[PDB]
């Protein structure tokens, strides 16, 4: 535990990247998160919404 800052920087970057990746599987108030299922199983207007 001597090079704490050099490891903490990499850990923070990895956590930021992981959060950015995981923010793709959220509904955000929509029906689902996959776009093709949304545009296939729904009418054009609600799909675009």
């Amino acid at each position: 535990s001597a090079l704490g800052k050099l490891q903490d920087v990499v850990n923070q970057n990895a956590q930021a990247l992981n959060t950015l990746v995981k923010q793709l599987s959220s509904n955000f108030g929509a029906i689902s998160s996959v776009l093709n299922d949304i545009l296939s199983r729904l009418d054009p207007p609600e799909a675009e919404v």
Partner: protein, 99 residues
Amino acid sequence: FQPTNGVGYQPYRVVVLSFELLHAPATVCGPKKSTNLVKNKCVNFNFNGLTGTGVLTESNKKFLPFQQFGRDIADTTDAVRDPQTLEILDITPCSFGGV
């Protein structure tokens, strides 16, 4: 059924095949088709319900006898087993970047 009558007094074995939908999950359905295994090319694949785009290499990730799909620490599709032949493939997106 005397074998001397006309064409209107002969046996007619009739089948009354019917179809109906209950609330239980469907267990009898029609057949499905399959294409060739074109690997080492960024194509569109759909094995059993999942979609995606990317080359399909032949990696060495050994799955369990009952496991079918495969993911990573990022929770993304990475390796799908072929249904016909028990050969674990590997999914990796093809070339992309800036010029």
